[PDB]
């Protein structure tokens, strides 16, 4: 029955990290009295922890923003290729945002070029699409949410070559349509472009805030 106790605390650790927060510590032993033939176990902890503060912000790598708008599908130093069997090109741009404190630069191509036809303001024959899938009940949490589906005058895209093989290095290009056409179709319910319909959503549940729900 010998009562053990703590000895002297050792040297404190220096702050491990060069940015932000870290943790320093001190180590003590139960070496001077020592519990012999039983007793207790020195009463407490052989380890203290402490937070150290370097007060300097940390590297954060930049992240890509979303891609911009596609450029028009025209040719440089020419005119336009609207409503014509001429494949062109168009470009798109990104922006690296958020890079601070010697962080890593954004990895990848900041530009994007793809091949295109042009149906910008092109009068195209059209046909009414079938009923779209029912949308979301809007407004969520607001008074009387309603869904919405719609039929729209879908243009008949012209039967062009979707794959255009260029020479030089024999590069074949997946060509996709660009532009807002002018779809021509017969009226359905007094409307030429889009006729929709709304229906109210049944048995709407109340929105309860998850931090207000846990508490």
């Amino acid at each position, epitope marked *: 029955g010998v009562a053990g106790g703590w000895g002297p605390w050792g040297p404190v650790s220096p702050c*491990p*990290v060069t940015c932000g*927060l870290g943790q320093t510590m001190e*180590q003590r*032993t139960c070496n001077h009295p020592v519990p012999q033939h039983g007793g207790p176990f020195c009463a407490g902890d052989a*380890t203290r922890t402490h937070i150290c503060n370097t007060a300097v912000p940390c590297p954060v790598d930049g992240e890509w923003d979303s891609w911009g708008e596609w450029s028009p599908c025209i040719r440089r130093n020419m005119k336009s290729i609207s409503c014509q069997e001429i494949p062109g090109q168009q470009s798109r741009g990104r922006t690296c945002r958020g890079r601070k404190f010697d962080g890593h630069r954004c990895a990848g191509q900041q530009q994007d070029i793809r091949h295109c036809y042009s149906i910008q303001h092109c009068p195209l024959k059209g046909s009414w699409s079938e009923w779209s899938t029912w949308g979301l009940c809007m407004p969520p949490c607001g008074p009387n949410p309603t869904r919405a589906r719609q039929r729209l005058c879908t243009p008949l895209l012209p039967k062009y070559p979707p794959t255009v093989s260029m020479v030089e290095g024999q590069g074949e290009k997946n060509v996709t349509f660009w532009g807002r056409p002018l779809p021509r179709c017969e009226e359905l319910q007094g409307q030429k472009l889009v006729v929709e319909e709304k229906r109210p959503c049944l048995h709407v549940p109340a929105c309860k805030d998850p931090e207000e729900e846990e508490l």
Partner: nanobody
Amino acid sequence: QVQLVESGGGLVQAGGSLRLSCAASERTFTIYAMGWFRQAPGKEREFVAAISRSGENTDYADSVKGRFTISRDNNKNTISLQMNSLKPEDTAVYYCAAGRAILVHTTKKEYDHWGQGTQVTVSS
């Protein structure tokens, strides 16, 4: 930044015991979480044991749990690996490793500082 020196290896009979020690740089010792690795002939390097900066939290590989014990002496800038019931499959070059840990109770498996190694050979 930190240098690591292993010691205690040698030739042991099967079932015997061996105690390795790893000396690290004195001024930066309590900053780094530390551990033991080994690399057998013809095999990749594998995790053996880890210890936090505290010496209070340990982690072990399943192949050595119950046989090996990692300890830390924060008075004398050393860690130790007490290897009991040694088998011929434990023959490897044993490496001491050091790794930066933000918390003092965190055990790591990824380390960016490595010693030169100590040879442990177990004969049947």
